[PDB]
Structure formats: C-alpha cells, structure tokens
C-alpha cells in the first residue's frame, strides 16, 4: 500500500478508530490511529493557519494550528522519519466529508525542504509558495474532487453554490518529487505552512484536512472517504 | 516547433550561422542567431559561474559569466518575455560537442521564479538549488547523453574515462513546470545561477552550454547536435 | 550632504521643482527633481503595493506601484549605482505632509540584497521582512515623527485620533548597514517591496512616501518637510 | 550579568568545570557547565560544519557538527527558550585559546530567524549569509582579538604569520538585534550554520568555538579567557 506520514486536522470524533471524543490535531504514522493528538476547537467560518516542522537531528515532528485572536493547539511526536519514509516522496493536502460536511478550502500553502551537507549551501533544496491557486495548475496533481475556484482558492472537497457536499474526497499533491533524505546528508529538514477555511451551515461538521507525505505514486485508496481522510484504505 | 529562450556559452565560432569570430556569450530568442553577444574567453579546465536574471518591469534579460581572478563577460537584451514565452515553461541546461569536444560539466544550479501581486507575499514562487546531483535524480528530466556521475556532477555530454566525446548532446530539465507569467501578476521575475567546468585535452574545443526556457514538452530536436547546442532543429 | 537614491510616490504636484502636473512615481538620483517619472493615480483609502528592483549587470532601477483591481504604474531608469552610492548604505522609508496631508502608513516591508561571486552561494546577503511592526522596534531607526501604532503599522507621519496632521516628516531606516557593493562582487542586486495606505478626509492630499538608500549616517535634513519628502535640504 | 545560550565546540577537556574527559560538543544554558554533551573528535587542519536549529513548538535545541568523509556528532536539549532569553538578542560566534592554542577560523556563517503568525508570510524574519568576510565589516561587531584577514576569513582569535597564539579571546556579533520572540507569535524558530577551521602545529589544542545568543549589549566578561570561551565570567 502507500506509506503515509500525515498531520490531521480532525473535525469529527470517530471513537471506534481511536479518535478522542473531541476535535483534535493528530500525528499519523502509517495509520489513521494517531500516535499523538491534542484537543483543537474548530472555529466554523474562520481562517486558520497550520505550521509543521521536522529536522532529522532533533527527530521531532511538530505541528501547531492557530486562529487569529490567540487560540492555538500544538502536538509533537518523536520519530526517525528516515526509517519510515522512502528517499523520494510527494507532499500534499487531503480532505474529506462523509455524512457530515464542511468546506475544506486551502487559501495558501508553502513548503521548504533542505538536505544539508558540509557548507552553508544546501546539497539540495526546494521551496514553493502558493498564495493563490491557478485555474488549471500544471504544478499540482489534483485527485478526486479537488479543484481550484474562481477566487483562486483550492477546494479539496466539493462545494456547490457555496454549500459543501457530503461524501466527497480530494487531494492535491505538489508535482515534483521531493528528495526527503539522502545517505550523504548530515541533516534533512522540512517546514510547511498552510491556511484553511472550514465552514459549514451545520453545527455538526466532518471530516477534516490533512497535510501528508507519501510515496511518489500515491493515489486515493478505495474506501478512504469520510473518517479515513482520503489517506488510508482501512482503519488498522 | 519548440519556443526557446536561451543564454548560450558558445565555445566555438560558427560564422555561417552568425557567430562572431571568437568565443562568446549570447542571448537567443527563438533562434540560434543570437540577438546580442559579448566576447568571452573560455578558461579550459577552470570552474566558471553564470548568473542570469530577468524582471518583467525592467524587461531586460541579463547574463554574466565569470571565472575566479577577475575575468567576467556580460550581455543584456531588452525584450518583453510575456510576448515570447507561454505561461507555463520548463527550465533546463543543454550542451553539445561536434567534431571538437569538451566536458560540459555542471557542478551546481539554482533557480528562483516569482510571480508578485499586491503583498510582500508572492502569489506564487519556486526556488530550487542543487549543489550536488543524485545518481538517479527523480526531480530532473535527463535527455540525450546527460547523466550524473559518481562525484555528484551533472555531465551534459558524454565523458569516457575522463575524456569528453565528439558528437554528443544532452539536456537536463527541472521536473516541475514553472508558472513564468500570469494575467493577474504585477511583476514576474526569475534568477538562475550555475557553475560549470569546460575542459578538454585539445586546444580547439566545442560546442558550448546553454541555459534555456522552453515549452513544457520540449525534447531534443532532430539534427540539433554540434553548433545548434541541442536547442534548435535548424539555423534560421 | 547625504547621498540619496530614492523612488518617490509623489501625491502632490509641485511644478516649481519640476514635478509633472499630476501625481506620479519618480526615480530620484541625488536630487528631488526626478530623473524619470510616470503618471500614477492615487486611490485615497486603498492599500497599494510597491516593488523596486535593481541588478548591477542590467543597470536598470525599476519600480512598479499597483492597487488591487488592475491599476499599475511603472518607471525605470538606467544608471550605474556603483558610481552613485557608497559601499555601505542604510535603506529606509520616508514621508511628509505640508499644507495638505494624508496618512503615510506602512503595513509591510521586505528587502533583499545580494552580493554574488563564483558560486550559487552568495558572498554576502541580507533579507528582512516585516509584516507587522513592533511597539518599540530595536531593529529600526525611527526619525522625526515616525512611530508604530497599536495595530502594528508603521506611521511615518503624525496621525491623531485617526486624522493625519499637516507639516509632519518621518523616516524609518533598517538598523543594519547594507553592503550594497564590493570590489570583488561580480553582481550586486537588491529587491524591495512595501505596502502602504494613503488616506485623507480631504480631496487634496500631500506630500508622498519614498523608499530610499542613503549613506549610513543619514538624518532628516533641516527644511526637508513638505515637497522635499524628508530627503533633501533643498530643491536643486 | 549577560544571559547566554550557547553551543560549544570544546576542544580541551577541563574536568574541574564539568567537561567530560574528551573533546565534545555541548549545549550551554546560562552556564559553562553544559546541560548536554556528546563526544566529538576534532580533526586538526580540516574544515568542519556546524548546523544549529530550534523551533518554539518542538522546544528542542539541536546541533550537529560534521567533517567531510562521514564523521558527525549531534547533541540536543529540550528547553523553552522563551523563558530563558529576552525578547531582543544578538547572535554571535566566540572563541578562545589558553595555554594550548589553535586557529579559530570562521569561513562562512548563515543565520535565519522567523516569527510566525496566521499566514504563510512571517510576522518578522531575518536572514543573513556571509561566505566571505569584508576587511572592515560594518555589519559585525568585533570584540577582543577578532579580526578579518586578507583571505576573507574571520579569525576569532589571534594568528601571527600563520601560527595561532596563546591566551587570546575574540567574538563577532551580528550588528542588528534579533527579535527572537514576541507575545503575539505562534511560533519562533531559528537556524544557524557555520564552517570553521581549527588547526594547530601542536597535538594538544584549546579551547574551542561557540555559537551564542545573548542580551544585545553583551561584551566579553572579564576573566572569560581559556576554558570559559569568552562567554562567562566564572564557572558556576
Ligand atoms: C456516520 O458515518 C459517516 O459520516 C462520518 C462523518 O462524516 C464519517 O466520519 C464516516 O466515515 C461515515 O462516512
Ligand atoms: C566541423 O563542424 C562540426 O564540428 C563543429 C565543432 O564541434 C560543430 O559546431 C558543427 O556543428 C559540426 O558538428
Ligand atoms: C503650499 O505649500 C506647502 O504645502 C505643500 C503641500 O503639502 C508642500 O508640497 C509644500 O512643500 C509646502 O509645505
Ligand atoms: C592550563 O590552563 C590554561 O590553559 C587551558 C588550555 O588552554 C585553559 O582551558 C585554561 O582556562 C587555562 O588558560
Ligand atoms: Ca475523525
Ligand atoms: Ca558556435
Ligand atoms: Ca510633489
Ligand atoms: Ca573545555
Ligand atoms: Mn483523528
Ligand atoms: Mn553563438
Ligand atoms: Mn515628484
Ligand atoms: Mn565543555
């Protein structure tokens, strides 16, 4: 199957697959059953920001999600990613809805990865930023229901005339493979930021957004809708 | 055919296609017959650096090539690239040899492109750096004879046991399409740097190296070896 | 006196010192009497963006100022800055009001300077970004009436209870001297962006905002209020 | 006194102040008696690289020091720096010799600091790189014996006709204060890299190099030579 590392912004508690009984941010290593979670209160209709970082010396994957006005939730997990991920990966954003629904709108996304050696100059590095998305982006792979709208936003799941739809799944991956580690590298690091808008006319919302790193040929698994966030074929 | 903008480092004068009678750097817009050239004295066996820049407000494409110890050659040409290039391009390095030959070795390559709007934050941007090349690079498209060697260098044309070979052509393109202009952008700019080593056991060398920007599906044209630098099918 | 290179956003025509009879953007080299201008229509109360760039190979200083919704004005001037500016400079923003007045509010400011040599790695470089300004910024030199407000904006000229005041002048300089050229550099370049809000309850407004580069010990000249934008002691 | 956080490259074991009995890298929080150390074998006469990173979500300060050819040593320490350091700091490099001596030569130094908020755009950020040092650097504060030489290197301690001298101490601080945290910031991070050459004609060498972060008005304490690395007035 795919090899997935993800940070989920999980807006609906599914306690049979080990979610806590509240909305949460989580770090997922090869499974939907998060290795670490923290309570996170979703603000329906407000723009939030997530920042994710990792460095191979520290071996600590951390994420923080915040809204304007002081509310922030952080989660970290110690793991050596060189022994989880393959050498070449693609990075992406995924989201889903199920019975309950929400917009999963991405307003901006930046990512940096560096492979360092014996110099201030990196052996290899990549940095991209999108603060607006093109109508027909040649540098993104859009999967499932993902599309860009006339406002320049990335809509990971279906929205019709301003209302989000049930049972939708979509992902966007950056087109270039990322060289996330190398046997000569002394340090490898990456940092990602994205801003998002989760909104729904309903009080009950689902299912969430995830930032993920996968094998380069990753596609949406069959049966990964709803609680599996378009990332996993099952809940093991 | 392809749409090509290139900066050539031309090591062999072919005066029937309009080269000056000396080695030179040139700016090529859709033709091998450079729109602007400057004399450039190749230092066989030394590492040189090229820096190339363009900004859509200034509308001036400039290049400088230098060797350690003070020797530098610059060339510029005023042109509106929005009316030459398509919206999406790939960027790359090309080189060739013919009857005369040289190594066309690339030691490092960096590129930045930005599309700016009404903020310090770019609408879109891309930056990559390679100070070493991987043995099997998933983020480069290698065409023709191009390969990476065990030292981590990019060899655009064939070298066997340390000697360069005649009648070789090769190119390397960065894998991701680059969004080089957009109808909403207020400014688009790009900057590229690469370092190279042209060496040959012979006093007479050929044919040169070019940095180029092309339509995304660009491939080596038939008959583009030698003086056409792997860029053009003919000398019109 | 000081040595000043500036890009002015001039909101009030003073035709006795050679302004055109309309609002304009201008490039100023050691004098208020701009070497190049372009018509610019100020949108009272809207946030605008300016982008300024220079590269020592191209020898073209360019600026563009734009507002959301497609309105943009550009100006360029060819000049070798190595023969105008000293080796070490400070960079800054200046503004003034006179009989007529406006807010001269800076919302964000970014600057990059690079001195390049024979590598992808710069010999020296500096990049700073402010998207918010601190209440007591230790990394800015504030001169005259300049202050930061409780919203995190930089107010270059006096505002009292939301109204701008007449006969005010203020500047902000970045604290570190910038090494803008070096006798070993093959290329020197800089790029600056800032966003601003010029607003006034009056239909008639003055005097403008300038981005400037000066000798490191530059201070506001006596008598530089109003039309001289806090940059020059006289109109020669 | 000063408030110092430092990463030491300690080339001489002083076991009365708690050094291990071997050369080591260490993380120092307000004291020379390192909170964490790792064995590090100095290669006399070879160029090494150090990389240091911290992020306020992860709260893990990490350092790695490496030489070409695969030899690397890493150390990390978990600490909340917001509760150690003041809001504004200067960053710097320090070194010393005592009875035993070595060159403490810095060949390059890069530093980045970011204060992040609710956007891909940083609230504030600073990045500088030096791959060569100017003869009279206006953007560094040189303290004690520190000087730049005709090769463009930074010599933190005295060298005469290619030989290092005993009982020398010197530091270099970047001129601009760095805004290392802010009460509105969601994340603060910094990353530093430098390359160095420790060489001596003697088999026994001392005392080491440190990267440090201090209160902005930090000066070399009296009696901080030798084992105290120019950082502390005593060994408490
Ligand atoms: C009732 O279950 C359905 O709806 C929820 C909420 O959307 C999803 O988590 C789940 O996978 C199913 O699709
Ligand atoms: C003699 O002509 C051949 O060799 C030169 C030098 O290599 C090339 O420029 C040319 O295209 C031919 O291949
Ligand atoms: C009437 O002249 C005054 O007001 C204008 C507009 O503010 C300024 O340009 C000028 O320098 C004087 O201060
Ligand atoms: C013998 O002690 C002296 O020399 C060593 C080695 O240089 C230093 O660590 C110490 O502080 C003293 O200066
Ligand atoms: Ca869930
Ligand atoms: Ca030729
Ligand atoms: Ca005027
Ligand atoms: Ca010691
Ligand atoms: Mn969950
Ligand atoms: Mn030619
Ligand atoms: Mn004017
Ligand atoms: Mn020690």
Closest Cα in chain B, distance from residue A26 (Å): 29
Show residues of chain C in contact with D177, CB under 8 Å: 138-139, 175
Q: Which helix (H) or strand (E) holds C31?
A: none
Show residues of chain B in contact with A118, CB under 8 Å: none
Query: Dihedral of the CA atoms A170, A171, A172, A178 (nearest 10)?
Result: -170
Of A39, A182, A128, B154, the residue nearest D120 (C-alpha)? A128
Show residues of chain B in contact with C38, CB under 8 Å: none
A-D contacts (CB, under 8 Å): 89
B200, B170 in Cβ contact below 8 A? no
- d(Cα C184, Cα C171) in Å, to the nearest integer? 32
- d(Cα A36, Cα A76) in Å, to the nearest integer? 7
Burial track B54-87 (b if 16+ CB lie within 10 A, e otherwise): bbbbbbbbbbbbbbeeeebbbbbbebebbeebee
Looking at the DSSP bridge assignments, the partners of residue D179 are: D88
Task: Assign residue B216 a region (left: φ > 0; alpha: ψ between -120 and 50; beta: otherwise).
Answer: alpha
Burial class (CB in 10 A: 0-12, 13-18, 19+), A16: exposed
Q: Which helix (H) or strand (E) holds C42?
A: none
A180, A188 in Cβ contact below 8 A? yes
Residue B114 in contact with partner chain C when CB distance is under 8 A:
no
User: Which residue of B119, B132, B179 is in closest CB contact with A123?
Assistant: B132
Contact state of C125 with D129 under an 8 Å Cβ cutoff: yes
A111, A213 in Cβ contact below 8 A? no
B60, B187 in Cβ contact below 8 A? no
Tell me the residues surrounding ligand 12 (ion) with CB < 5 Å: D 10, 19, 26
- d(Cα D179, Cα C134) in Å, to the nearest integer? 9
Those residues whose C-beta lies under 8 Å from the C-beta of residue C215, and which sit 6 or more positions away, are C2, C3, C86, C89, C90
Show residues of chain C in contact with A121, CB under 8 Å: 119-121
In this structure, what are the phi and psi dihedrals at residue D15, rounded to the nearest 5 degrees? -75, -15
- d(Cα A177, Cα A217) in Å, to the nearest integer? 10
Nearest residue of chain B to residue D121 (CA atoms)? B121
Tokens coding D236: 């408490």
Ligand 3, closest atom to CA C167? Answer: 13
Extract long-range pairs of B163-166: CB within 8 Å, 24+ residues apart: B163/B201, B164/B97, B164/B101, B164/B102, B164/B103, B164/B104, B164/B199, B164/B200, B165/B97, B165/B101, B166/B97, B166/B98, B166/B99, B166/B100, B166/B101
- d(Cα B63, Cα B75) in Å, to the nearest integer? 5
- d(Cα D19, Cα D15) in Å, to the nearest integer? 5
A 10 A CB-CB count for A155 gives 23
Burial class (CB in 10 A: 0-12, 13-18, 19+), A164: buried
Task: Assign residue D235 a region (left: φ > 0; alpha: ψ between -120 and 50; beta: otherwise).
Answer: alpha
Those residues whose C-beta lies under 8 Å from the C-beta of residue B151, and which sit 6 or more positions away, are none
Give me the half-sphere count of Cα atoms (radius 13 Å) on the Cβ side of residue C74: 14
The ligand minimizing its distance to the Cα of B24 is: 10
Is the bond leading into C197 cis (omega within 30 degrees of zero)?
A: no
Within 6 Å (CB) of ligand 4, which residues are found?
D 12, 14, 97-100, 206-207, 226-227
Show residues of chain B in contact with D121, CB under 8 Å: 119-121
Residue D119 in contact with partner chain B when CB distance is under 8 A:
yes
Tell me the residues surrounding ligand 10 (ion) with CB < 5 Å: B 10, 19, 26
Domains of chain B: 1-236 (2.60.120.200)
Of A55, A188, A112, the residue nearest D62 (C-alpha)? A55
The number of angstroms, rounded, from the C-alpha of A195 to the middle of its chain's C-alpha atoms is 11
The number of angstroms, rounded, from the C-alpha of C127 to the middle of its chain's C-alpha atoms is 17
- Convert chain B into a string of H (helix), E (strand) and C (coil): CCCEEEEEEECCCCHHHCCCCCCEEEEEECCCCCCEEEECCCCCCCEEEEEEEEECCCCEEEEEEEECCCEEEEEEEECCHHHCCCCEEEEEEEEECCCCCCCCEEEEEEEEEEEECCCCCCCEEEEEEECCCCCCCCCEEEEECCEECCCCCEECCCEECCEECCCCEEEEEECCCEECCCCCCCEEEEEEEEEEECCCCCCCCCCEEEEEEEECCCCCCCCCCHHHCCCCCCCC
The number of angstroms, rounded, from the C-alpha of A165 to the middle of its chain's C-alpha atoms is 20
Nearest residue of chain B to residue A125 (CA atoms)? B129
- d(Cα B152, Cα B161) in Å, to the nearest integer? 16
SS3 C185: coil
C176, C146 in Cβ contact below 8 A? no
Q: Which residue has the tokens 């101490």?
A: D169
User: Which residue of D119, D179, D216 is in closest CB contact with C134?
Assistant: D179
User: Which residue of D116, D129, D195 is in closest CB contact with A51?
Assistant: D116
- d(Cα C95, Cα C103) in Å, to the nearest integer? 9
Of C173, C165, C121, the residue nearest C143 (C-alpha)? C173
Tokens coding B171: 């190119």
Q: Report the Cα–Cα distance between both ends of chain A, in Å, rounded.
A: 12
Residue D134 in contact with partner chain C when CB distance is under 8 A:
yes
Report how far ligand 4's centroid is from the alpha carbon of D90 (Å). Answer: 27
Task: State the best of C110, C116, C124 to mutate against chain D, taking most chain D CBs within 10 Å.
Answer: C124
Give me the half-sphere count of Cα atoms (radius 13 Å) on the Cβ side of residue D76: 16
Ligand 3, closest atom to CA C166? Answer: 7
- Convert chain D into a string of H (helix), E (strand) and C (coil): CCCEEEEEEECCCCHHHCCCCCCEEEEEECCCCCCEEEECCCCCCCEEEEEEEEECCCCEEEEEEEECCCEEEEEEEECCHHHCCCCEEEEEEEEECCCCCCCCEEEEEEEEEEEECCCCCCCEEEEEEECCCCCCCCCEEEEECCEECCCCCEECCCEECCEECCCCEEEEEECCCEECCCCCCCEEEEEEEEEEECCCCCCCCCCEEEEEEEECCCCCCCCCCHHHCCCCCCCC
Of C173, C198, C154, the residue nearest C49 (C-alpha)? C198
The residue to mutate among C100, C200, C231, having the most atoms of ligand 3 within 8 angstroms of its beta carbon, is: C100
- d(Cα D215, Cα A76) in Å, to the nearest integer? 30
- d(Cα A149, Cα A135) in Å, to the nearest integer? 7
A-C contacts (CB, under 8 Å): 5
The number of angstroms, rounded, from the C-alpha of C152 to the middle of its chain's C-alpha atoms is 19
- d(Cα C93, Cα C170) in Å, to the nearest integer? 9
Contact state of B55 with C63 under an 8 Å Cβ cutoff: no
Nearest residue of chain C to residue A121 (CA atoms)? C121
- d(Cα B91, Cα B109) in Å, to the nearest integer? 11
Contact state of C51 with B57 under an 8 Å Cβ cutoff: yes
A 10 A CB-CB count for C93 gives 26
- d(Cα C91, Cα A225) in Å, to the nearest integer? 53
Residue D118 in contact with partner chain B when CB distance is under 8 A:
no
Annotated ligand binding at A19? The verdict is yes
Query: Dihedral of the CA atoms B229, A122, B66, D132 (nearest 10)?
Result: 180
- d(Cα B170, Cα B94) in Å, to the nearest integer? 6
- d(Cα C109, Cα C128) in Å, to the nearest integer? 8
DSSP state for residue C221 in the 8-state scheme: P
- d(Cα B51, Cα B35) in Å, to the nearest integer? 18
- d(Cα C199, Cα C67) in Å, to the nearest integer? 14
- Convert chain A into a string of H (helix), E (strand) and C (coil): CCCEEEEEEECCCCHHHCCCCCCEEEEEECCCCCCEEEECCCCCCCEEEEEEEEECCCCEEEEEEEECCCEEEEEEEECCHHHCCCCEEEEEEEEECCCCCCCCEEEEEEEEEEEECCCCCCCEEEEEEECCCCCCCCCEEEEECCEECCCCCEECCCEECCEECCCCEEEEEECCCEECCCCCCCEEEEEEEEEEECCCCCCCCCCEEEEEEEECCCCCCCCCCHHHCCCCCCCC
C25, C38 in Cβ contact below 8 A? yes
The ligand minimizing its distance to the Cα of B34 is: 10
Nearest residue of chain D to residue C108 (CA atoms)? D123
Tokens coding D220: 């070399």
Nearest residue of chain A to residue C124 (CA atoms)? A120
Tokens coding B9: 């480092």
The ligand minimizing its distance to the Cα of C75 is: 11
B92, B198 in Cβ contact below 8 A? no
- d(Cα A108, Cα B191) in Å, to the nearest integer? 23
Looking at the DSSP bridge assignments, the partners of residue D25 are: D9, D38
Of B29, B22, B77, B69, the residue nearest B53 (C-alpha)? B77
C169, C117 in Cβ contact below 8 A? no
Q: Which residue has the tokens 């090529």?
A: B28
Of B191, B183, B181, B178, the residue nearest B54 (C-alpha)? B191
Tokens coding B44: 């066989």
Ligand 1, closest atom to CA A167? Answer: 13
Of D205, D234, D219, the residue nearest D90 (C-alpha)? D219
- d(Cα C170, Cα C157) in Å, to the nearest integer? 5
The number of angstroms, rounded, from the C-alpha of B172 to the middle of its chain's C-alpha atoms is 10
Show residues of chain D in contact with A66, CB under 8 Å: 118, 186
Of B108, B92, B90, B7, the residue nearest B54 (C-alpha)? B7
DSSP C135-155: SS-TTEEEEET-EE-TTS-EE
C86, C4 in Cβ contact below 8 A? no
Residue D183 in contact with partner chain C when CB distance is under 8 A:
no
Of A208, A205, A213, A212, the residue nearest A229 (C-alpha)? A208
- d(Cα C127, Cα D121) in Å, to the nearest integer? 14
Distances (CA, A) of A181 to A135, A173, A187, B152: 32, 19, 8, 15
Give me the half-sphere count of Cα atoms (radius 13 Å) on the Cβ side of residue A2: 26
Contact state of C120 with B60 under an 8 Å Cβ cutoff: no
D81, D180 in Cβ contact below 8 A? yes
DSSP state for residue C220 in the 8-state scheme: P
DSSP state for residue C44 in the 8-state scheme: T
Q: Which residue has the tokens 């809805």?
A: A97
SS3 C111: strand
Those residues whose C-beta lies under 8 Å from the C-beta of residue C229, and which sit 6 or more positions away, are C6, C8, C10, C32, C94, C95, C96, C207, C208, C209, C210
- d(Cα C133, Cα B80) in Å, to the nearest integer? 37
Of B110, C112, C186, C124, the residue nearest D129 (C-alpha)? C124
SS3 C213: strand
Show residues of chain A in contact with C121, CB under 8 Å: 119-121
A42, A23 in Cβ contact below 8 A? yes
Those residues whose C-beta lies under 8 Å from the C-beta of residue A235, and which sit 6 or more positions away, are A16, A17, A32, A33, A227, A228
SS3 C174: strand
Alpha helices in C7-122 (DSSP H): none
C128, C61 in Cβ contact below 8 A? no
B-C contacts (CB, under 8 Å): 89
DSSP state for residue C47 in the 8-state scheme: E
Handedness of CA D61, D65, D69, D70 (dihedral sign): negative
Distances (CA, A) of A225 to A100, A157, A211: 12, 11, 16
Closest Cα in chain C, distance from residue A122 (Å): 9
């Amino acid at each position: 199957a795919d090899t997935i590392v993800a940070v989920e912004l999980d807006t609906y508690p599914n306690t049979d697959i080990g979610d806590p009984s509240y909305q949460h941010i989580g770090i997922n290593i090869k499974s939907i059953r998060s290795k670490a979670t923290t309570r996170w209160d979703v603000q329906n209709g407000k723009v939030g920001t997530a920042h994710i970082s990792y460095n191979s010396v520290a071996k600590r994957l951390s994420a923080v999600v915040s809204y304007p006005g002081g509310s922030s939730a952080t989660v970290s997990y110690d793991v050596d990613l060189n022994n989880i991920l393959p050498e070449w990966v693609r990075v992406g954003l995924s989201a889903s809805t199920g019975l309950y629904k929400e917009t999963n709108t991405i307003l901006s996304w930046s990512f940096t990865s560096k492979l360092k050696s014996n110099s201030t100059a990196d052996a290899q590095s990549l940095h991209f930023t999108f603060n607006q998305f093109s109508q027909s982006p040649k540098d993104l792979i859009l999967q499932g229901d993902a599309s860009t709208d006339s406002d320049g936003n990335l809509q990971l799941t279906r929205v019709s005339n301003g209302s989000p739809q049930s049972d939708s799944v979509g992902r966007a991956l950056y087109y270039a493979p990322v060289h996330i580690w190398d046997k000569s590298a002394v340090v490898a690091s990456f940092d990602a930021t994205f801003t998002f808008l989760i909104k729904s006319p309903d009080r009950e919302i689902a299912d969430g957004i995830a930032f993920f790193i996968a094998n380069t040929d990753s596609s949406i698994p069959h049966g990964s809708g709803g609680r599996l966030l378009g990332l996993f074929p099952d809940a093991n």
